[PDB]
């Protein structure tokens, strides 16, 4: 189906102690493939997926220089933003940046994005047309006016609509055995009696890729929400994901409840029932 | 836009000179180049953003700083032993490939050992001849700047208070008034050609202006003649029916 | 990284075609630029490849062709003008946080077309009425060589092309003067015609 490449950048100021901590990661869909950590000893962009190992040394030289240039800009932004909000020099603050591109099932351009956050709140973001900006407050309006006069949206649009889509297609081809292979969830249910009249039914979904999935509980066919607990999708650690949904049902009425699992790797939706 | 140190400047042996370069374009990246005759543009230093600068190909003998976003001062130390060089400053929005570089006017830096032979130019305008007016119906004015040293001048023509470029050509290189001497003073000529009708109008005002680059105001001068400071010397001529 | 401009000096007559080669040695995606430096002026952008059409139109009838396979960005103009006489610089950027790289440059000399040559030598007198005078050799064709002075007491400037753009008229001119007593405009340019 659809696909996406995304890059994440985080810079945390450590005033008085040195340069900001800088961490950068790259994702194709739900798979990380590159990383950089300013506290690592290599001081280089590093691979994190097997299909990116096919890139020559000039790839890693280019990505290392560009990723360090990102950290230099964030280093100055932390100082600039500190002055925009009249903050003190002794406090720690965080800059976050995310951008990338989505493609459809035909691998043609679908949308691009470029977003920026200060201290975990929206600061400025590129709009859908990739030609204008959304400023979240007065301090960001100064950035918006600066970035509009410099026409930096033209440069980003050329990357998001061109370079970004071209390399996403290349990665999907070089990693077709992993990025294009779907992993259906392996499901099972557990039963635990919390008393002599109620029981907990937990519907499990393990070892699936990609991470998108929906678990819904139904009683006699109608949806259920009360006494239903749903946990966030979590990484298993091997490239696949896990998720479970639980419900507290009366004893002797377990056969009235059904768990419905929907995932790309499933030809038809799964239906789970305890007896 | 971008501004830098004056188009001409000189230094003495054992002295360091700092060339200024400023821009109000809100640009992150700034650059310093040295333009050599057969080598093109050679990068000395570049600054991706404030507080960050990296060496170019010929950084040896030079130093820079980037404590502010607007300024990128280049310092030429005494270890730099080029008798003459042309320095260009540039800036761009970022170091990105999509951003072109905007360039300052440039700066000629000369090694001047003895300052006692620095002289400002004398300027005179020579009026067109009646022979040319009758033969071609055109009138050529000739401006002549003489006796200046070093060859740091900028000649311009002004007609009725406005600078003109059409019908103007200036010698690309000055002449040595004493071509056998290494410290010869220089001479420069220029031409402005107008129609005979225009020159024959007495209301028309012609002016040749020469900007000379010499000593600054804070330089020491212990000679008999006037201090040959940076100045403008001019000569004018009006029409003749 | 390096940028190669193969022609160091190009001399062209007016209305002739211009073809300045440019090649770069970097092997990835790039952005490309052409800069022009007119005499007495600073470097200014002529055209650039941002994206899209490999054939890039520029100012003053210039056009460049970006060929990814040949790593070339040749600059062309079908009919050069005298005002095109300048220095031309090719520049390429390699998209890996490295500064823009310029070629060695190409000096273009466009031979001025003189339509109605009328060579003559005129005497011009100082406007301050100081009895000083200069000699003006003007209106000669572009294939005429103005030789230097053969006497340090006599000064002869190189030839000089002015353009009266309102009349579409270009003319050559050289100036001679001397503080000698024997000097005269009749024999000022004999080393190289109408004489009043």
């Amino acid at each position: 189906g659809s696909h996406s490449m995304r890059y994440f950048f985080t810079s945390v100021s450590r005033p008085g102690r040195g340069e900001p901590r800088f961490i950068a990661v790259g994702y194709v869909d739900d798979t990380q493939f590159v990383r950089f950590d300013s506290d690592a000893a290599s001081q280089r962009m590093e691979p994190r997926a097997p299909w990116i190992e096919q890139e020559g040394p000039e790839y890693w030289d280019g990505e290392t220089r560009k990723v360090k240039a990102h950290s230099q800009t964030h280093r100055v932004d932390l100082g600039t933003l500190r002055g925009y909000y009249n903050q003190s020099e002794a406090g720690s603050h965080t800059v976050q940046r995310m951008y990338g591109c989505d493609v459809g099932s035909d691998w043609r351009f679908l949308r691009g994005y470029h977003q920026y956050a200060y201290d975990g709140k929206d600061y400025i973001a590129l709009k859908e047309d990739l030609r204008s900006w959304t400023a979240a407050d007065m301090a960001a309006q100064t950035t918006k006016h600066k970035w509009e006069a410099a026409h930096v949206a033209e440069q980003l649009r050329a990357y998001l609509e061109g370079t970004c889509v071209e390399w996403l297609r290349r990665y999907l081809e070089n990693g077709k055995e992993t990025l294009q292979r779907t992993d259906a969830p392996k499901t099972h249910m557990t039963h635990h009696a919390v008393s002599d009249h109620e029981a907990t039914l937990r519907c499990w979904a393990l070892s699936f890729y990609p991470a998108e999935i929906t678990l819904t509980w139904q009683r006699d066919g109608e949806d259920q929400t009360q006494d239903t607990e749903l946990v966030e999708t979590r990484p298993a650690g091997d490239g696949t994901f896990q998720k479970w949904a639980a419900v507290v049902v009366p004893s002797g009425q377990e056969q009235r409840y059904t768990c419905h699992v929907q995932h790309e790797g499933l030809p038809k939706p799964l239906t789970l029932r305890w007896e | 836009g971008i501004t830098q140190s004056p188009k001409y400047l000189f230094r003495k042996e054992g002295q360091n000179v700092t060339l200024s370069c400023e821009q109000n374009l809100n640009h992150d990246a700034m650059y310093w180049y040295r333009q050599d005759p057969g080598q093109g543009l050679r990068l000395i230093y570049y600054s991706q953003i404030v507080n960050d600068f990296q060496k170019g190909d010929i950084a040896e003998g030079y130093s820079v700083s980037r404590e502010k976003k607007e300024s990128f001062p280049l310092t030429v130390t005494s270890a730099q032993k080029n008798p003459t060089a042309f320095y260009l400053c540039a800036s761009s929005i970022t170091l990105s490939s999509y951003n072109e570089q905007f360039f300052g006017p440039g700066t000629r830096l000369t090694v001047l050992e003895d300052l006692k032979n620095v002289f400002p130019p004398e300027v005179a305008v020579f009026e067109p001849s009646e022979a040319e007016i009758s033969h071609t119906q055109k009138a050529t004015l000739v401006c002549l700047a003489t006796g200046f040293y070093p060859d740091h001048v900028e000649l311009s023509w002004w007609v009725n208070g406005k600078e003109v470029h059409s019908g103007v050509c200036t010698d690309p290189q000055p002449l040595k008034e004493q071509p056998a001497l290494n410290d010869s003073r220089y001479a420069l000529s220029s031409r402005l050609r107008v129609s005979a009708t225009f020159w024959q109008d007495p209301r028309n005002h012609f002016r040749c202006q020469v900007q000379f680059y010499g000593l600054s105001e804070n330089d020491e001068w212990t000679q008999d003649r006037a201090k040959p400071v940076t100045q403008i010397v001019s000569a004018e001529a009006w029409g003749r029916a | 990284q390096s940028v190669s401009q193969h022609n160091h000096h190009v001399i062209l007559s007016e209305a002739a075609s211009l073809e300045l080669g440019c090649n770069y040695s970097y092997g990835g995606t790039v952005n490309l630029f052409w800069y022009v430096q007119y005499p007495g002026q600073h470097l200014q952008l002529l055209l650039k490849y941002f994206s899209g059409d490999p054939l890039v139109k520029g100012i003053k009838g210039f056009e460049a062709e970006f060929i990814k396979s040949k790593f070339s960005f040749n600059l062309r103009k079908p009919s050069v003008q005298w005002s095109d006489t300048a220095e031309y610089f090719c520049a390429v950027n390699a998209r890996r946080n490295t500064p823009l790289v310029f070629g060695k440059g190409t000096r273009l000399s466009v031979i001025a077309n003189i339509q109605n040559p009328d060579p003559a030598v005129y005497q011009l007198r100082d406007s301050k009425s100081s009895d000083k005078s200069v000699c003006l050799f003007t209106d000669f064709d572009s294939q005429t060589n103005v030789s230097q002075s053969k006497d340090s007491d006599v000064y002869i400037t190189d030839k000089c092309v002015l353009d009266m753009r309102s009349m579409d008229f270009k003319s050559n001119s050289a100036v001679a003067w001397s503080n000698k007593s024997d000097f005269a405009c009749a024999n000022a340019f004999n080393n190289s015609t109408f004489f009043p």
């Binding site: 560009k66 800009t73 940046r97 950035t143 970035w147 | - | -």
Partner: peptide, 9 residues
């Protein structure tokens, strides 16, 4: 690959 150096805020 990622984008080139960004403009400062």
């Amino acid at each position: 690959i990622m984008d080139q150096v960004p403009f400062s805020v």
